[PDB]
């Protein structure tokens, strides 16, 4: 049995589906059993890391777990995993842990505080460490739906966005094929792209020009305070200013693990085109 936590999510849903396709018994962690909103063949379970007694029942007879970095409860998970006889944990982490002075960064520190307890536990592990998720572009969907323009603080800020399906394929490979125990994979998409480049690629999927223009930082800060705590807004804008005009690193890891080219953001945009139009 494999437990896929967050089995309703972008990545977890695809992992669980692909595992059922291979004829494997899959448990899917969900918020509510009346739902469950999961692929055919996945057994819905509560796997709430803030209630470790739910974890104990979720892990009964489970061989392997796909885990997403919970903000709370990793020590409780490690305990119950050990006691249940789990042999392999695949963790969705972040490429931030690989950067210099990752302790000095909040995002880096958050992910390190989940990796380290797993690393020190005695459990078999694989870490999957993506850069920016392509799915972050869905945040522009409401704006793109109504306009020919996305306004942002840093149109020139680079990321290397990774398609969720590639992440899911790497996770599935780590769970079902040999050579991934104690491996930590840094995943990027095949191209480093500016925000403005990404917007234009969504325009291409839609078949119409979508521009990306600079807005003053204070305006951008105000709007972002509509979505986030003022502290987090400050950190977002600092990260974007640092990546402004700075191509991010492109890694070959997806191809090296899966044997298939990494999916492009152009491909991503086409796959998700329905989100961007009426």
Author numbering: 2 to 279
Pull text from the paper.
SimC7 is a polyketide ketoreductase involved in biosynthesis of the angucyclinone moiety of the gyrase inhibitor simocyclinone D8 (SD8). SimC7, which belongs to the short-chain dehydrogenase/reductase (SDR) superfamily, catalyzes reduction of the C-7 carbonyl of the angucyclinone, and the resulting hydroxyl is essential for antibiotic activity. SimC7 is made up of two domains, the larger of which is the nucleotide binding domain that adopts a Rossmann fold; the smaller substrate binding domain, characteristic of the so-called extended SDR subfamily (Kavanagh et al., 2008), is mainly α-helical and is largely formed by two insertions in the nucleotide binding domain (between β6 and α6, and between β9 and α10). Our results reveal that SimC7 is structurally distinct from previously characterized polyketide ketoreductases and, importantly, lacks the canonical SDR Ser-Tyr-Lys catalytic triad (Kavanagh et al., 2008, Kallberg et al., 2010, Persson and Kallberg, 2013).
To investigate this possibility, we determined the structures of SimC7 alone (apo; 1.6 Å resolution), the binary complex with NADP+ (1.95 Å), and the ternary complex with both NADP+ and 7-oxo-SD8 (1.2 Å). Overall the apo, binary, and ternary SimC7 structures are very similar, with the notable exception of the lid motif, which displays a number of different conformations.
